[PDB]
Amino acid sequence: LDQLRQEAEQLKNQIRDARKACADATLSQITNNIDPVGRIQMRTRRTLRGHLAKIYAMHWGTDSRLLVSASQDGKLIIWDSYTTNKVHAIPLRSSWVMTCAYAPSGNYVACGGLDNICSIYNLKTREGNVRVSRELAGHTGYLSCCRFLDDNQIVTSSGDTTCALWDIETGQQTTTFTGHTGDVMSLSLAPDTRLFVSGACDASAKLWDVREGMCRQTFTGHESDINAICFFPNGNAFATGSDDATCRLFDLRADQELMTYSHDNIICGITSVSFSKSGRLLLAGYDDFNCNVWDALKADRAGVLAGHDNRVSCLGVTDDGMAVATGSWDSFLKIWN
């Protein structure tokens, strides 16, 4: 009935009023005196070849040497970045894969896609081959992202506007997160592994509680679908990339938006977003085959990563912050430095 409607409206107005009241000075005014970072120039140091189709996802290992990539040709390759060797090549049952992950311990990898199933692979067996350890079912839409919490827990987000926390031991949904009104496109895990954020297609992002509960923040501000999300290394902020050619940095404690990283020569959407080890550089991947580096504290561009002949679809930074790897639709990975 109506009373719910104007109660919701009044609550929204109260939230907006509190957010406005908490705003006294922008980040630009605070960081005006900080000297510029200068031009940042990186050169391609390695190129990984062997995929025969568009590359849709990638993930680094916690040792900052091994990485896994997924492509539409039905293969899941594990690389040795230092020597560009191939360690494993896992053939998938379904060729429509759009995500992958690498376990913190290094014993498992995951993948999923249009088949609505997350598959877990075991890399350290006594038979010398990689075998499927479990297939997780229950989502009614394509899987868009998955991240490992432990060797026995994984968080997945699918196109049925839901996120779920699984139990790899039994293959059951321990917890289900609801509240979005559009396809959930990406998620990121907090450094302490207690909270995580998701970016849906309703132009909003929410902050969940893994231990128990549901969303508590519901950040807004974008004008189109959010395609990527990433936590700040401090764990008190995150960045979102959307289809309106704009990246934005949100903060949790003040519950607002700090900056917007836009331009006038950029009209294409963002496919991936990542930070650096210090948190000063913000690397984003665009559809115009480029990858821009943004000074996070001044919202000023400070470099370009050109060299890809098609759309950049994935991006990652090592744990020690010594390299940046970008995958694209021309079936090549390049490690910059």
Binding site: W96, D115, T140, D160
Partner: protein, 216 residues
Amino acid sequence: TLSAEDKAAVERSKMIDRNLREDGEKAAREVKLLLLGAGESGKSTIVKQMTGIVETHFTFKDLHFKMFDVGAQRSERKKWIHCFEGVTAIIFCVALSDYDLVNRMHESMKLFDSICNNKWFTDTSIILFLNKKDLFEEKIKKSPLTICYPEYAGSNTYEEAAAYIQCQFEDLNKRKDTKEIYTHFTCSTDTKNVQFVFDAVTDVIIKNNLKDCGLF
């Protein structure tokens, strides 16, 4: 300068590369078809003569086809339609016995307009299948072809009924210099639709080969 355990790793990587190349060469000799429709439009019978994605393999004249039926994907089509950018052709199923009901022909026209003029499928040929001919006979004999298409200037026989439904669908194509629409008036039992698909795919493959030459 490589040590004893590095040369063996290089050899293993070389073997992996050889296997990957062989698999790619084997998988580059197959025809991929994307099957679309408005639901309950004869997709079942079309599959008969030949969760998420439902693949289907069949062979004809020493040629291996693969048909992907998206089907039950109820999410936003915009976010995954680019996965099928490299399909050889698109099969579209329309029922001719849906004009006097609710309107569904307008929905099929809307879907065809959305798919045909997509930015990803700017050069993908479309094979149009028009089903339910047998029921369509009595349906046009009884119900006139004006409830769905107003301002119709024609008789009520099959001679004009077959047309003015193919013309409208073929008129929704706007880039008539890169892709072509193939139309077939299939029925419940014909046992010759596979030949039509084979002819369309042969034309598409000839065009792709000519493009590869640089001739185009």
